[PDB]
Amino acid sequence: QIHSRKMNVSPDVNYEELARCTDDFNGAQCKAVCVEAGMIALRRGATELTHEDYMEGILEVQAKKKANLQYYA
Amino acid sequence: ESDTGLAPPALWDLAADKQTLQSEQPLQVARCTKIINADSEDPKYIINVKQFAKFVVDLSDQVAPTDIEEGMRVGVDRNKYQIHIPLPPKIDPTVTMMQVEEKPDVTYSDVGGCKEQIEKLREVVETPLLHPERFVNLGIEPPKGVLLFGPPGTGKTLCARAVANRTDACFIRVIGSELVQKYVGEGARMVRELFEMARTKKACLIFFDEIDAIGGARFDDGAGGDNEVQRTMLELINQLDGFDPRGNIKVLMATNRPDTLDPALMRPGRLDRKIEFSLPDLEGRTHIFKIHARSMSVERDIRFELLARLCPNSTGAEIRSVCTEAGMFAIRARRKIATEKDFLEAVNKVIKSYAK
Amino acid sequence: ENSEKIKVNKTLPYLVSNVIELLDVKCAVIKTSTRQTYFLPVIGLVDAEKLKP
After folding, report:
1. Cα–Cα distance measured from residue C44 to residue B35, given in angstroms and rounded to the nearest whole number
2. For chain B: N or C, fewer Cβ within 10 A?
3. Which chain A residue lies closest to B119 (C-alpha atoms)?
4. Where does the protein end up (chain C)?
């Protein structure tokens, strides 16, 4: 909420959903999603933010780490 | 016989009668030194010879105490050691020699497959130059410097040229070793000269190639007697901020080593965005094969997917090397075109000699 | 007249050095920046009790 203060944010942003979805982050990584979710909003040209932007911002950090090791059923 | 700098008398015959006598007794002799530091409201300048001693002398009344900074070759009296008119290193056109402003012979299609970073370089370069509207209305400052990093020859020079012909206005390439000079305090003046004479004209692009040499490498851990790369590095981080109140000209750096990283550069106001380049998956490789075959005589019935399957880990300089080597196989016999098996040997020659 | 006479003999071009020690039978040893060592009976305008090696 602090790093999002300096930008134009739509006020319909639930911090329950944000605190629930953010797991094992720090202040650097919570800042990093907030920068990315704004730049994702810069790509589509909207002047506001939603929970969809931050979930996309979270997934852009690790860039969807998933390797099916294929041994495991 | 000897020469001793002679000439036939038609140009110096009139010079040698009374002009030599006026260059002796009126014209004095000065020396050059270096300037360590200075003081405030009073000169009290400390000057070293590096061969004699360190002297604490004063300037003359011929110059004003305005441009005399730390590290400038100044004129030194023989008796009172007073500071005469300082001398500049080199004049004048050292900016045009790296700013050709010329249309490069690079097609926009010459980089195929990794288009995601090219669109990133489209947004960072082209949009604050020509579409500065959404940056104002929403409330994010546009970035003005991006570092590039990753494996060498991945397309660093290719993508940096892809934006060069894209707008065709004031492209400046800086060689990283060109700023590694011999004199004490030589590049930091040139960095001042580059930054002022680029801010005069609008829509300008400056690229820093191979910042492993001067762009924050080891900051000062190996050079403990010269201190030139650091002073230039301290100067460029000094002149980048402060002396940029809402500019237009973009500055890009590229490195191979992902270690020479200043956190003071990643302070917000100098460098904000991370854009790296990665290896092609399948098709970005095959595109480069399609690039480096169309200019030479090859068979029209051969494919390029099979060659890239034999090369898991490869860069464009390696792919160019195979085409030149498979080029040489066709020259070994009397073949005026290139056949597939010459490419197959060149894969096995390049890869299976040292790589794996 | 003395503060005039100290001022006239006060030239500007100076030389840096390194104080090595200090004695009394006031007395100080000077090593200049030309690798040259010197010694005085009396120091000068500054005192003996305001300096250090």
Report:
1. 28
2. N
3. A43
4. Cytoplasm; Nucleus
Experimental method: cryo-EM
B136 lies within 8 A of chain A by CB: no
Residue with tokens 């030139």: B228
Q: Chain B window 75-104: which residues touch C at a Cβ cutoff of 8 Å? A: 80-81
Instruction: List chains touching C (3+ CB pairs under 8 A).
Output: B
Q: Which of B186, B174, B182 is nearest to B90 (CA)?
A: B186
Contact B46 C16 (CB under 8 A): yes
The Cβ of residue B69 has, within 10 Å, a number of other Cβ atoms equal to: 12
Phi/psi at B145 (5° precision): -170, 130
Per DSSP (E only), the strands in B199-301 are 205-209, 250-255, 273-276
Return d(Cα B325, Cα B346) in angstroms, integer.
Answer: 6
A47 in Cβ contact with A7 (< 8 Å):
no
Specify the DSSP element, H or E, that contains B187: helix B187-199
SS3 of C26, please? coil
Each residue of B28-38: b (16+ CB within 10 Å) or e? eeeeebbbeee
Sign for the pseudo-dihedral over CA of B114, B117, B119, B125: negative
Closest by CA to B345, choosing from B280, B332, B336, is B332
Type of residue numbered B344: L
Resolution given for this structure, in angstroms = 3.6
- List Cα–Cα distances, C15 to B45, B188, B279, C21, C30, in angstroms: 12, 29, 62, 18, 11
C-alpha distance from B43 to closest chain C C-alpha (Å): 11
Chain A within 8 Å of B139 (Cβ-Cβ)? yes
